Amino acid sequence: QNMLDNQTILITGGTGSFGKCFVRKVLDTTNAKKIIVYSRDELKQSEMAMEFNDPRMRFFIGDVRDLERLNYALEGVDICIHAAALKHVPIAEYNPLECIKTNIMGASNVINACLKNAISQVIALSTDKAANPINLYGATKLCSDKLFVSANNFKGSSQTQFSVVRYGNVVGSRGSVVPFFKKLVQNKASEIPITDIRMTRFWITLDEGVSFVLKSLKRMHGGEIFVPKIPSMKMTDLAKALAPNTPTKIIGIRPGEKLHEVMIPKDESHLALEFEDFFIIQPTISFQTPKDYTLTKLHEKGQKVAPDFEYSSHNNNQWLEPDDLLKLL
Amino acid sequence: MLDNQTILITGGTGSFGKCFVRKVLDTTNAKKIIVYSRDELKQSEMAMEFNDPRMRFFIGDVRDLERLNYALEGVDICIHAAALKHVPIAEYNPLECIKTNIMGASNVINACLKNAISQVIALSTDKAANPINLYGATKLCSDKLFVSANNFKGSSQTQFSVVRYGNVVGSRGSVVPFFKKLVQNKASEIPITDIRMTRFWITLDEGVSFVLKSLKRMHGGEIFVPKIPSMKMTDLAKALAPNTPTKIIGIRPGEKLHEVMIPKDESHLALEFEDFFIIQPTISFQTPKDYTLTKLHEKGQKVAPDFEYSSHNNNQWLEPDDLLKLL
Amino acid sequence: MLDNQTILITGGTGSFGKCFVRKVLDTTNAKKIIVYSRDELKQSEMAMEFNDPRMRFFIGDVRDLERLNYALEGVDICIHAAALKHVPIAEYNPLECIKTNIMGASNVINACLKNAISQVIALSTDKAANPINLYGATKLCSDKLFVSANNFKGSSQTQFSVVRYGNVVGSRGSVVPFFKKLVQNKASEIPITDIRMTRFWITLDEGVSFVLKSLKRMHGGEIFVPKIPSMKMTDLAKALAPNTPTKIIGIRPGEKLHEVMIPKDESHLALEFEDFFIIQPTISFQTPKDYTLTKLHEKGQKVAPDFEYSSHNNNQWLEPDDLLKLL
Amino acid sequence: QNMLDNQTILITGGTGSFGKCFVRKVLDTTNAKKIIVYSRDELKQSEMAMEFNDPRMRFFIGDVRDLERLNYALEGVDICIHAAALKHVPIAEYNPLECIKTNIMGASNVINACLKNAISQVIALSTDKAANPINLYGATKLCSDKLFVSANNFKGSSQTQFSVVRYGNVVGSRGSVVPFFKKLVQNKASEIPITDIRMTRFWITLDEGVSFVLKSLKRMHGGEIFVPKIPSMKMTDLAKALAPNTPTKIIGIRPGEKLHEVMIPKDESHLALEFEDFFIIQPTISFQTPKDYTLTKLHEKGQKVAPDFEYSSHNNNQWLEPDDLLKLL
Amino acid sequence: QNMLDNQTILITGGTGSFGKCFVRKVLDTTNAKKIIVYSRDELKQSEMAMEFNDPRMRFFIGDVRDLERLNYALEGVDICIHAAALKHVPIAEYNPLECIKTNIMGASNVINACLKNAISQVIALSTDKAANPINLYGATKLCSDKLFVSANNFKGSSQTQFSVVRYGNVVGSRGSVVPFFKKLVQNKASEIPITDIRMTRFWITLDEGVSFVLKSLKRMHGGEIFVPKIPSMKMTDLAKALAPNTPTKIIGIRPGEKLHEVMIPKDESHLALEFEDFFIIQPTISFQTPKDYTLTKLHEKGQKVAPDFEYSSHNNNQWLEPDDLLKLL
Amino acid sequence: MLDNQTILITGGTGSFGKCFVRKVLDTTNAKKIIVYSRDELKQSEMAMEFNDPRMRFFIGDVRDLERLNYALEGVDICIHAAALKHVPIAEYNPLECIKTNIMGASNVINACLKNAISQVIALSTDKAANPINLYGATKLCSDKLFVSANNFKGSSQTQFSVVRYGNVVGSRGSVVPFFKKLVQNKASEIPITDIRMTRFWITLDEGVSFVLKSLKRMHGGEIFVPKIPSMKMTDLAKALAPNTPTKIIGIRPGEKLHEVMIPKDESHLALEFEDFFIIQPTISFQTPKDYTLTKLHEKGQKVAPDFEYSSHNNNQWLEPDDLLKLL
Ligand SMILES: NC(=O)c1ccc[n+]([C@@H]2O[C@H](COP(=O)([O-])OP(=O)(O)OC[C@H]3O[C@@H](n4cnc5c(N)ncnc54)[C@H](OP(=O)(O)O)[C@@H]3O)[C@@H](O)[C@H]2O)c1
């Protein structure tokens, strides 16, 4: 019950869509002692401090590529939510090392600084793009996920648990598809570009993600890659919600984009454990002090999966109509 | 043209390393061949087996940008083969693999641009296509860095390409050579992972010739893939042991049943050729290039929309008798 | 001459940033304009609003010397506008402001000399004259570094100048634009700091034109100051709200009642011109310069011994009606 | 009473005028367990160890720009006096980054290393040149002062107090004015250069400064910029003490020099608190665990000041005659 | 008695001749809780894990030139054996900075990381080449030895003892003389090269070295340079054991080679203490908390030496015949 | 040829430092002499005593590679005299001595190659031959780095040599000058270490002339050793105090009874000359050199097989009367 009770939480990339939503959720629904936003931009932090004018907030201007600054911010932290990252796929293809420095080396420093300040639980955000990735960005998240999972194979005088939360497209995220079909039809959208007529994706709301991360804290043992069960929607149906009466030119594809997204690769189905509405991808490596992932801290039991299971988007159980999208737009 | 050129190869004391050096001495007119690796043990031995004037050894680490700057001084061609490739060990030492493979790639690129090297080819791997293990992810980032490196421009231009191929028959501590120490071990029990297991197979000599060919074809920015045969991991044992038991020890941390070399989501970037494949960059360059015509004037063509070059669905297969011919 | 030149501007996605880019495209013949900033959000948007061939974006941090080296490759002109300027936030995150503003300045200078950039202009601020807050101190060190950078010499010379001016009307999150969100907020209560509060006021467009003019005037080593109007912070509210209460919320961490732009102890270094002021270096250079004649052959003159260009004692003042004309 | 009793003290720039005087004062008047001199030059340390041949002394060759070395020296220290710096104003104008590295980054590393080794009290030396500065040097001290004051806004498992001590010209300092009018008249001073006939400065003795720093330790809460009440003297009267019978040519001004020095800027008078003979400039930012600066640890009460107060040299209460200067030369 | 009982041991350069032998000795003869091999090559570690397939083993891929990685590996270690190094003398002459980075800076980081993780005992391996050295390699070991000895002059909240073990040529080491006269006669040795006909060296077996290091742990106080009493053999007699029936061409000398090796320099005989079969070269500097090196932890008493003693190889008590060499080949 | 050349000398404010500068101004036509050292105290004073246009001071640390890069810009000759030499202090602060002497040497070499300096001479010491103390070990590594630095090659070549000699009579805080402050101290008690104590003795002026001569002789890679006299440490007191007691205070941390300058195990590398010795490199270079003929065409010759240049067995000795003539 309420384990953020009197705990100090630090969230990197805290000024982003997830960050503001996560901070908002934690402030409203928990007795967290203090909530630390760790990010770089003074503009956004300056703005955020005004809209979240709360004494339980602390803003540290800092970069996840700077270990000394992180070591200083995590000082006395209990829980670290790692949401900082460079995720604009095509921009990442043109700026490889930047994305590597922020996502890979950033993961690296956060883990180092958390261990040093003896943090209790750490959850880093992943992405479906990190499974059998093709673009660099996805490659940097895969390296990220791997570091956090491996970070558990440590042995300090205070067990620090490291877990990962992976989920697909965030319906209407700060720069996604939905938040475009609105910004275009607002400035006389001559026509809203599309791509492949097979394009499918997983879907979830920002609130669902936050809630999920918040709950993963309650059942995590450390080492897990939690995957929530979410619905998928073909990119066509997403053409009748923010401009059905406006044509949509066909672009086909964009740099480093897939036709379908993978959440749980086939080659990892033996590590995958199933639950009522979420999966647990177990560590591919073994830890010194092994844990039993079949029983979460929330005493929710899990069963393995089909030796030939593949949790992909091109074909999942749940889907969504252009109404549900507006009903949850 | 390698004539009178200076060539540096990171990870020069490795399998590919030794073989590449041997091939360059014997067949090219390279003026100088520089080996850049960390271990003094392997370098002293290698200098003994290759007692040749055109050879030069530099004790160095790719994680050291300053040292690379120093050693790439006056080099025309750079072959990047340095890496931590043990997949399961990379799973336990992720940051080590990231520093060597990813940062390593970054430094090399930096030193190469600085010393104005003409062409660079970095060695990739099939494990970098739709990767699952850390090693593959690092190599994927590596390929990316090298491909992106082509957008840099100054008083001098540098061409960066990548060569990607699967398992190397009898590579430094691989499977095939292991299926020997077992025969010698008077042991009668072959350790398998999964009857479905499949991989692409290229020879040390073939990989090396493909790199040399690539140098002559590259515009810069390509990921060259040689068309090589696949082989059921069930026959690799059969062939190298027609009689002996196969104890299914399961899968190791990070293994795939089949390795992809040209992902399905990249078929549109692929260009087919007589013996090879060029996966085109996914980004545009200041100075565009036409990958349909190599520098050797070889014409390439697009592949079918649902194309994918994997080990499972390969039209070529190594025969247990034609495999024994490799060794 | 910006004709056919390559221009890089750190902090290119900022207010001055976007405006400077717009002015350079529309009016110059600059061959290439490079935006160098950290955020992918602002850069993707900016590339959309400026869909032009001569534009190029580099995701980078001024705290990264290696990345700057890379991006300044082949650049002729460099405009340094990157900085952490929120005064109170700089008061809580001093080292952050020091790293970005002071170290940032240092790296840029280094990369500029390395890539042999012809001219560099760094943006200063009135808060850097007889400063009190951390931000101002960092900018003061910045100006100093840039001014001192002119003593460096090699096969190529690089000119470093600084442009200093006060508040930018309606700048990214300033006061004036805030006195709008309040009107919209249906709020009837204007937050003031002190009836005496005074500041210099220049427009985004004016600041930009002054930088472009400076490039054409600079010998290297100058701190250009434009003659701009002052305005009682009491009228900025009056003008933008002839009717509404003013609740004196006091002073914020680090504020001054009046901002100096040319200190009294520097009057001897000052040179007066038609529209601007040049504060001469306090040190001597290997290659001296005559700051009394800009490159546009504009003749300057010394000011009175007890001279000081402050906001409190300014001979020019923005009229609440002529202020509404800015917006 | 005697709080250096059995404490280990580390003083950076310990081989300088202040350092030798401070070490001398501490050795003679306290039961400090050990006194660590942290500086770079082997020559001076070598010399100092001979003149201060005391077992309670420890000399660490080190640079304040090297965090690892500092982390190693502060190990087990209780009190840190930070006196290291580059202060030759004109030399600083020609060597900007050097002065920045030593004074700014140096401040930076000392604070970091003190926190890491859980030091109790830290006092960094400032200078009147840091108030409304014009020269770079002064700018580096202002950045310094700001870092030390901000360093208090931390929260480690052992409160470390950070304070600053600022005062003007040190009568006859290792390279000042007085110690020149002697070195010139000794080698047939044809004429001793002067400047502006309005030039005024604050004055204090090396011993007074040491004593002041030593007492600031006894009353500091952490976060203060202590300013002692000291006298001022026009640069003319300082022309009749070490060569009244020798002319003085007029140079006018030197690189980055002011006519008058500011100790407490007008724009900070609201932060300024007054006491019988010293001031306390309060933090412009607020700390999490606020302290009451109106009551020092020495139970000395302070009152605010005139809303339009300015503690400048061009006009202060106390002044000095060319006798007092020789009477205290 | 058995002080490795339940202790965690970390040995850098653990995949080398010494490393494998040392790990082998510790696994077989002690109740060490865990044994950590710290080295760079995946090939060797991969190989070693197979031949030493023991649960009490842990392999960390790491470089001694990387402090952050070391800080992470020594975490929770009790005893550190430092065997990592670049020792190919001529290769070191052509790659000076490399050898300096690995041996000097490597020593530097290990000491730093051991202190940080509060290691109990640390023994770094030296070499007779470090006494009055001529080659760079030897110069890097001398700098190394000096750092470890000096490392004792520290004062942390957990005394860490630092000692050095120095001995000569390891009979048949991974790349020495003996292991050559075999690899040559195996591939039709036309003739096996030799040098100066005065060439003498000290000798010892790999097992003797391990055992010695293992025992130095039991009697060390910290600060010692233990030197075992070992025999010497002229390079001629070493020509009748692995090819007496094959001629030996005369090369004379090689880059940076001496005619004779020094173990205890004459100028240090006043620091040297003698024992039944090993020497103790005492610190040239004095520590704050001085120890009595005349009485080892094994209660073995030692007496000083002749004020003009020199422990060189060109003339020592024990020697060896080409039989003993094969009898112990 | 120092004519119209730019000379930088690290540790320029030191004993050798000041003397070298004085000799270069007075006798050469060097266009510029740059002093690169850390302390502002000593530099401000030195600039006063050397108020000359060709002088220039750079506040910097040899541990700073970036700063060295900056200061060596446009330098032709580099004299490396910066170091921590106090033997006992180096014994307590080993890493400090290693950073300054060893890393310091490394950075200087790096910056020199980068800025394409023509010739570099680094100051060594007798304590670096068959060393025992940390200081000597660091200098030995230093010499090595500099000697090895000659194997680097690019569009420009740089020559690196080392000058090695013993004690400098009355050097900044040495023995002789101390045996003065004792006389002045009205003290009647001379502190000795050991009646056998012996050292080589060269004058500040001699060391400086030998460096200047070396520049004119060097091919690059040599360790020049001047033939200088030895002197019983018993006479240095006798001479400077014919009457006063000698209280044997023993030996200090790291002292030798006698200092070697050319080790016995190096006699084969030595080449004898009229006034000096060249110890040849122990490694071979890409571009070999003939050290038997300096650039001044001085012919050298091999020494006897068991040769060794030590202070104990020197054929030259300073006479207590000819020593007083030095001072
Ligand atoms: N002294 C002798 O009797 C003797 C005998 C044989 C050989 N030598 C050789 O002569 C050389 C110089 O001797 P010296 O008597 O002129 O010594 P010195 O009087 O101690 O001068 C050495 C100078 O090096 C500078 N320095 C020290 N650390 C530095 C750093 N980290 N970065 C930049 N500069 C640094 C110091 O200047 P700052 O403190 O202002 O930085 C100092 O002025 C030595 O290297 C030694 O090898 C001396």
Side-chain angles (χ1 to χ4, degrees), chain C residues 168-189:
Chain C
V168 170
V169 182
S171 66
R172 207 170 70 153
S174 52
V175 59
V176 180
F178 179 64
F179 274 27
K180 302 306 187 60
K181 295 168 299 179
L182 294 181
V183 179
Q184 173 207 303
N185 199 72
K186 296 293 183 301
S188 61
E189 58 184 69

Side-chain angles (χ1 to χ4, degrees), chain A residues 90 93-97 100-101 104-105 108 130-136 139-140 142-143 146-147 150 153 198 253-260 265-268 270 284-286 307-308, chain B residues 88 91-95 98-99 102-103 106 128-134 137-138 140-142 144-145 148 151 196 251 253-258 263 265-266 268 282-285 305-306:
Chain A
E93 297 295 312
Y94 281 105
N95 299 274
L97 200 51
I100 284 161
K101 287 177 174 168
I104 304 181
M105 300 316 289
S108 176
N132 298 284
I134 43 176
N135 59 66
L136 176 76
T140 65
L142 179 49
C143 286
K146 286 292 191 176
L147 289 160
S150 181
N153 213 303
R198 295 169 296 175
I253 294 174
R254 326 186 317 182
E257 197 176 298
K258 287 186 178 184
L259 286 187
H260 314 298
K266 184 172 186 176
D267 285 298
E268 300 188 311
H270 51 108
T284 72
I285 53 173
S286 299
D308 276 286
Chain B
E91 288 298 320
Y92 288 97
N93 307 275
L95 194 52
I98 279 164
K99 288 177 183 164
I102 308 177
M103 297 317 298
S106 153
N130 289 299
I132 51 166
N133 53 52
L134 176 74
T138 71
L140 174 51
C141 291
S142 184
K144 288 293 184 182
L145 290 170
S148 157
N151 254 325
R196 292 165 296 170
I251 301 179
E255 272 185 305
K256 277 188 182 181
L257 292 189
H258 312 311
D265 286 302
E266 301 215 299
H268 59 96
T282 185
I283 52 172
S284 296
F285 295 124
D306 56 300

Side-chain angles (χ1 to χ4, degrees), chain F residues 142-265:
Chain F
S142 184
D143 299 354
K144 288 293 184 182
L145 290 170
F146 281 106
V147 173
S148 157
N150 286 289
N151 254 325
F152 175 69
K153 295 187 173 185
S155 69
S156 178
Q157 183 80 71
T158 304
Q159 300 180 174
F160 301 94
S161 296
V162 183
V163 169
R164 172 191 292 168
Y165 49 67
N167 298 231
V168 170
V169 182
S171 66
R172 207 170 70 153
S174 52
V175 59
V176 180
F178 179 64
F179 274 27
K180 302 306 187 60
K181 295 168 299 179
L182 294 181
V183 179
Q184 173 207 303
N185 199 72
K186 296 293 183 301
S188 61
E189 58 184 69
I190 298 304
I192 297 302
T193 52
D194 182 294
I195 72 176
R196 292 165 296 170
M197 217 59 127
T198 291
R199 298 280 183 276
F200 291 101
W201 292 100
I202 190 171
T203 51
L204 205 26
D205 170 53
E206 278 171 288
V208 177
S209 306
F210 189 58
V211 172
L212 289 176
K213 285 172 186 169
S214 296
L215 288 177
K216 306 169 194 180
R217 290 169 171 159
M218 70 186 275
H219 298 290
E222 309 99 326
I223 287 189
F224 295 107
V225 172
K227 294 176 171 179
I228 51 172
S230 302
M231 172 179 263
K232 196 188 169 202
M233 189 53 233
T234 240
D235 292 59
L236 176 54
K238 171 193 298 179
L240 305 179
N243 43 290
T244 185
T246 54
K247 186 253 292 186
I248 316 304
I249 51 173
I251 301 179
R252 295 130 54 193
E255 272 185 305
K256 277 188 182 181
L257 292 189
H258 312 311
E259 303 290 359
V260 181
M261 197 139 75
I262 299 188
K264 187 172 195 165
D265 286 302

Side-chain angles (χ1 to χ4, degrees), chain D residues 272-303:
Chain D
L273 282 172
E274 177 167 36
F275 298 87
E276 280 185 295
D277 46 42
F278 74 89
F279 296 108
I280 277 189
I281 299 175
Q282 288 166 276
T284 72
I285 53 173
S286 299
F287 298 139
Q288 288 173 293
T289 304
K291 298 151 193 165
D292 190 311
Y293 298 97
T294 69
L295 214 197
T296 82
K297 285 288 177 55
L298 255 57
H299 292 297
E300 309 166 295
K301 192 75 177 183
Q303 328 293 314

